Design a protein around this ligand. Structure first.
Ligand code: JC2
Ligand code: CA
Ligand code: CA
Ligand code: CA
Ligand code: CA
Ligand code: ZN
Length: 316
């Protein structure tokens, strides 16, 4: 909407106060004009018709329980925009400052979040498996990263290409979580998963097997559930990424860690310059090796560690 840029204040899903960029025109709208061609957050009002209505508020204060998922979807989309722009020189998900749109309060009891081809969508959860999913910065960044993937490598959402697609979203979700630097970890979704159980998460990148996901190619899932295991076999690539960054010895193979920033540079370059819609795990290894070679040189530690990490997870 046309209006003037304003700054509201509110509370997110976990009860924390934050400022949000809004727009005033009769109402205050969740429309942040400070980033690209805007970040826009919508109320889906417990229905499934998208996007719903641009979020309107009478007083620019967002402290109601119903407001909390909107506050976080809006704010964490901004953090994710900032990560891609400041760290990777990428302007929004399309590289051309496309408007970023999110809807919250999608459906009833909906234990998921997704990119629908055009926008982000967040359930409220059922209160048992999830609370409103936009409360997780790693979740928000996971969803926006699907849009980045779709505009770049275009990885098809099935089998190995789909597991790479998933891992890319977990990797950058985690790197955004570290960028914001509030309780960062290598776990996925911990801030919104199972409010009655402490210390768990939906997936682990440091130890995927903690939640039944494979940590070696020999343990990959080969069936048809979950689009051929896209959220399962992502563990193999998540583990490789974790090892590149943090190091470790895994199934007897030692990896010298090179840190998060270099992980992110290598995988961003692989995603945007080398991967294709049908890339498999072996082709990802090759893309990561080439990316590290471009950035750091063929004889570098970074290249050697990429090879070590893929060896450790059984990907040649
Ligand atoms: C990070 C966590 C919290 C959420 C994440 N969701 P996602 O990966 O982005 C789900 N996207 C998806 O399916 O896209 C395909 C699609 C959909 C609509 C239009 C076009 C293409 C996830 O891991 N979900 C799991 C667990 C959900 N309980 C799961 O779906 O099995
Ligand atoms: Ca208000
Ligand atoms: Ca965390
Ligand atoms: Ca996390
Ligand atoms: Ca929990
Ligand atoms: Zn995903």
């Amino acid at each position: 909407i046309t209006g003037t840029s304003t700054v509201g204040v509110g509370r997110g899903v976990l009860g924390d106060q934050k400022n949000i960029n809004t727009t005033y025109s009769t109402y205050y709208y969740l429309q942040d004009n400070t980033r690209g061609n805007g970040i826009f957050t919508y109320d889906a009002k417990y229905r499934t018709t998208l996007p719903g209505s641009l979020w309107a508020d009478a007083d620019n204060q967002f402290f109601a329980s119903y407001d909390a998922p909107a506050v976080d979807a809006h704010y964490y989309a901004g953090v994710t925009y900032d990560y891609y722009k400041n760290v990777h020189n990428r302007l929004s998900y399309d590289g051309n400052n496309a408007a970023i749109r999110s809807s919250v309060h999608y459906s009833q009891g909906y234990n998921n979040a997704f990119w629908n081809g055009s926008q982000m969508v967040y359930g409220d959860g059922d209160g048992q498996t999830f609370i409103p999913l936009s409360g997780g910065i790693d979740v928000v960044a996971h969803e926006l990263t699907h849009a980045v993937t779709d505009y770049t490598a275009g990885l098809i959402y099935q089998n190995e290409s789909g597991a790479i697609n998933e891992a890319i979203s977990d990797i950058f979700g985690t790197l955004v979580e570290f960028y914001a630097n509030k309780n960062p970890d290598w776990e996925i979704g911990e801030d919104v998963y199972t409010p009655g159980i402490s210390g768990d998460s939906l997936r682990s990148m440091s130890d995927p097997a903690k939640y039944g996901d494979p940590d070696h190619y020999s343990k990959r899932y080969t069936g048809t559930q979950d689009n051929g295991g896209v959220h399962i076999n992502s563990g193999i690539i998540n583990k490789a990424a974790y090892l590149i960054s943090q190091g470790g010895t895994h199934y007897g193979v030692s990896v010298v860690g090179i840190g998060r920033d270099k992980l992110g540079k290598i995988f961003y370059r692989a995603l945007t310059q080398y991967l294709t819609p049908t890339s498999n795990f072996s082709q990802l290894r090759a893309a990561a090796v080439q990316s590290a070679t471009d950035l750091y040189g063929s004889t570098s530690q970074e290249v050697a560690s990429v090879k070590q990490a893929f060896d450790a997870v059984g990907v040649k």
